[PDB]
């Protein structure tokens, strides 16, 4: 089967460091292919030495910040029945998307029966969050409502839920995002906590 037009959408996980992305074909092929990727970035050359865990990742490394130059990449496929290529351009500000935070736990308070404490941790792959302020998005919702409540938070790794119920548990899913550059990331894995009840 001849190769088709692949999909090329890159994403920057670390803003101070470089970025990485892959390329795949919509229709699979029964024979192996050979790929060659090159970067121009105006009038320059990029090597992006390849040493990933999963293939098709050369880990392009950034060199300048706030260069106001639209990054463009061009891929090329090869096959015994044909050879196509794809060139996609973007910017160094739209592909910025951090990783979902880990170690998201909650704990009730013994004094108030309708208050919960949520404390999470910053992603390890992301750099120092104190230098680059992040924006967290907490969503607390019971296990039977199936209606998420969107609450935007400021810089901080703590939240005091004053809307929690006294006889039902909740689930918390928090995301990660820079202050003014990039879009929202994925949510957390899971969370479970019960409120305090006197007996």
């Amino acid at each position: 089967l001849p190769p088709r037009e692949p999909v090329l959408s890159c994403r920057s996980n670390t803003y101070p460091k470089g970025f990485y992305c892959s390329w795949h074909l919509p229709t699979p092929t029964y024979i192996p292919n050979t790929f060659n990727v090159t970067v121009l970035h105006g009038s320059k050359i990029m090597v992006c030495e390849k040493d990933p865990a999963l293939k098709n990742r050369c880990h392009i490394r950034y060199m300048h910040l706030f260069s106001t130059i639209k990054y463009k990449v061009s891929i090329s496929v090869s096959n015994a029945l044909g050879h196509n290529a794809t060139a996609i351009t973007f910017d160094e500000f739209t592909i910025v998307k951090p990783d979902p935070p880990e170690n998201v736990v909650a704990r009730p308070v013994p004094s108030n029966p309708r208050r919960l404490e949520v404390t999470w941790q910053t992603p390890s792959t992301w750099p120092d969050p104190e230098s680059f302020p992040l924006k967290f998005f907490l969503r607390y919702r019971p296990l039977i409502l199936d209606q998420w409540q969107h609450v935007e938070l400021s810089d901080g790794t703590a939240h005091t839920i004053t809307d929690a119920y006294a006889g039902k548990e909740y689930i918390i899913q928090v995301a990660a995002k820079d202050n003014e550059i990039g879009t929202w990331s994925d949510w957390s894995v899971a969370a479970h906590a019960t409120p305090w009840t006197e007996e």
Binding site: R114, Q149, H150, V151, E152, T162, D163, Y165, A166
Partner: peptide, 13 residues
Amino acid sequence: EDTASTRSSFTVQ
């Protein structure tokens, strides 16, 4: 003291 901070939604119980 329950709604002392900025919030988008709120539930009365």
